[PDB]
């Protein structure tokens, strides 16, 4: 009578990202400049 | 230029010798050397 071990992954860690903090940070001028590019943040948020 | 009193433990704007930023200032236990002025983190942003 033998006993064997098998290991299988199931889940994965969940992450969230912020656009303005990563790209611009603590500068308002960069935010006002970045407001005129598009809506990539919506796509990133939806995927995550 | 002018000068102003130092406030701590409140989110404020600071201009240290031309270095502009927004954040909260705290007493530090770090030890510097006579030829050093500030430190940096992994992403080359000032922390001390």
UniProtKB/Swiss-Prot annotation, chain B:
Superkingdom of the source species: Viruses
Region (Disordered): 1-14
Phenotype for residue 43 to D: In strain: Alpha/B.1.1.7
Job of this protein: Attaches the virion to the cell membrane by interacting with host receptor, initiating the infection. The major receptor is host ACE2. When S2/S2' has been cleaved, binding to the receptor triggers direct fusion at the cell membrane. When S2/S2' has not been cleaved, binding to the receptor results in internalization of the virus by endocytosis using host TFRC and GRM2 and leading to fusion of the virion membrane with the host endosomal membrane. Alternatively, may use NRP1/NRP2 and integrin as entry receptors.
Assembly, per entry: Binds to host ACE2. RBD also interacts with the N-linked glycan on 'Asn-90' of ACE2. Cleavage of S generates a polybasic C-terminal sequence on S1 that binds to host Neuropilin-1 (NRP1) and Neuropilin-2 (NRP2) receptors. Interacts with host integrin alpha-5/beta-1 (ITGA5:ITGB1) and with ACE2 in complex with integrin alpha-5/beta-1 (ITGA5:ITGB1). May interact via cytoplasmic c-terminus with M protein. May interact (via N-terminus) with host bilirubin and biliverdin, thereby preventing antibody binding to the SARS-CoV-2 spike NTD via an allosteric mechanism.
Protein name: Spike protein S1
Species in which this protein is naturally found: Severe acute respiratory syndrome coronavirus 2
Residues of the full protein shown: 528 to 575 of 1273
């Amino acid at each position: 009578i033998s006993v064997t071990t098998e290991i299988l992954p199931v889940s994965m860690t969940k992450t969230s990202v912020d656009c303005t903090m990563y790209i611009c940070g603590d500068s308002t001028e960069c935010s006002n400049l970045l407001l005129q590019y598009g809506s990539f943040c919506t796509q990133l948020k939806r995927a995550l | 230029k002018k000068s102003t009193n130092l406030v701590k433990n409140k989110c404020v704007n600071f201009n240290f010798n031309g270095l502009k930023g927004t954040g909260v200032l705290t007493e530090s236990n770090k030890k510097f050397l006579p030829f050093q002025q500030f430190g940096r983190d992994i992403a080359d942003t000032t922390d001390a």
